[PDB]
Amino acid sequence: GNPWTEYMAKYDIEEVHGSGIRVDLGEDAEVAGTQYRLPSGKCPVFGKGIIIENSNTAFLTPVATGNQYLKDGGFAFPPTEPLMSPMTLDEMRHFYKDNKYVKNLDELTLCSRHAGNMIPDNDKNSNYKYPAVYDDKDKKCHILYIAAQENNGPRYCNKSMFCFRPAKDISFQNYAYLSKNVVDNWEKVCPRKNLQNAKFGLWVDGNCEDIPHVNEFPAIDLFECNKLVFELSASDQPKQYEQHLTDYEKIKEGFKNKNAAMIKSAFADRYKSHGKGYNWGNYNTETQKCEIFNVKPTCLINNAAYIATTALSHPIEVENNFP
């Protein structure tokens, strides 16, 4: 039979991640008598951040509160006393040093759990848990107050509505986007490294065959291939999606209801990917072709021209298991 089964289980993205990648909104959770969509993916998404179109403020900037202008803030938790976010890895380990379940988790899992200990809107019995972004450059966990990931449709964002989209920009290379479900053992069960000298294949009749149909995109390097796979990957919101709001919904708020619905994502199963999509790519380094496909790979082919990548993987790091 197939000898690749155990090794190739981490590339079964529907099984190990189970949610959208580009936009992760695979669960709903009630907060104070209203259902809200929130990230539920079990793997980290390496290299992912939010670009805010036409505003200059970076998305890990804290949200504006009170009389602060919204354009002056980002998506992260506002300051607290003591400061819950941002918190470094060392501060997190010290803060949880009496919890044996939390204190020795991997830095990403620890950041996901720390984010998950914050109460939303004073509803103690809520199941809603904030997502987070860990930045490996300075070892900082940023808790995200805003769980929305894309608002970039033609009615509202044609070019006080924030317009934004998820991306793997070069400046986001050290970030990991963490849902509340990020597993303790992600390093063993999820992708991170790209596989140098390796091409995904399909095991057929005792042989690793080529992916029989691929979607070829030109990419100058692995980074750009990884960026393309992410853009085509499993997604829990359609591209350019905009919620229809009635005039009664507009008037209920003392605020821009489009912005409120666009940022908090009120009320869905029609839109959930469950991890299904164009999550894999074979990057040909010689022909500069990102070969993108939407089925689970079941083996690897040794080929020196290739690097095997997924939407969840880091956009740069490679490991060479055919040395």
- CA-nearest of 147, 318, 301 to 223 is 318
- CA-nearest of 60, 26, 63, 37 to 133 is 60
Co-location of 286 and 152 in the same domain? no
93's CB contacts (< 8 A; 6+ apart) are 103, 104, 110
Co-location of 113 and 197 in the same domain? no
- CA-nearest of 87, 58, 89, 90 to 74 is 58
Co-location of 2 and 105 in the same domain? no
Co-location of 182 and 216 in the same domain? no
How far is the CA of 16 from the CAs of 11, 76, 287, in angstroms?
8, 27, 31
Q: Give CA angle at 41 (124, 104), nearest 5°.
A: 70
Phi, psi of 189 (to 5 degrees): -110, -10
* Under 8 Å between Cβ of 44 and 179: no
Burial of 197: CB neighbours in 10 Å, binned 0-12, 13-18, 19+:
buried
DSSP assignment letter at 279 = -
d(CA 296, CA 12): 5
Co-location of 278 and 227 in the same domain? yes
Co-location of 89 and 112 in the same domain? yes
Co-location of 67 and 125 in the same domain? yes
| H helix count then E strand count, the chain | 8, 16
Q: Give me the helices (H) in the chain, please.
A: 5-8, 13-16, 89-95, 107-116, 186-189, 222-231, 247-252, 257-264
**3-state percent helix, strand, coil for the chain, nearest multiple of 5:** 20, 25, 55
d(CA 229, CA 281): 6
**Structure tokens given for 214:** 């691929």
3-state secondary structure of 293: strand
**Structure tokens given for 34:** 């209203």
d(CA 99, CA 176): 24
d(CA 1, CA 197): 24
Co-location of 185 and 196 in the same domain? no
Co-location of 32 and 83 in the same domain? yes
113's CB contacts (< 8 A; 6+ apart) are 102, 105
Co-location of 282 and 164 in the same domain? no
Q: Give CA angle at 308 (20, 300), nearest 5°.
A: 110
Specify the CATH number for the domain of residue 229: 3.50.4.10
d(CA 102, CA 289): 43
* Under 8 Å between Cβ of 151 and 164: yes
- Domain extent, residue 246, equals 18-189+237-271
Question: For the chain, what is the domain count?
Answer: 2
Co-location of 267 and 285 in the same domain? no
* Under 8 Å between Cβ of 210 and 216: no
**Structure tokens given for 298:** 């079941």
183's CB contacts (< 8 A; 6+ apart) are 42, 43, 109, 189, 190
Residue 44: asked if its preceding bond is cis (omega within 30°), the reply is no
Neighbour order of strands in the sheet with 140-143: 45-46, 175-178, 132-135, 140-143, 87-88
d(CA 301, CA 8): 12
Polymer length of the chain: 323
d(CA 298, CA 229): 18
Co-location of 30 and 176 in the same domain? yes
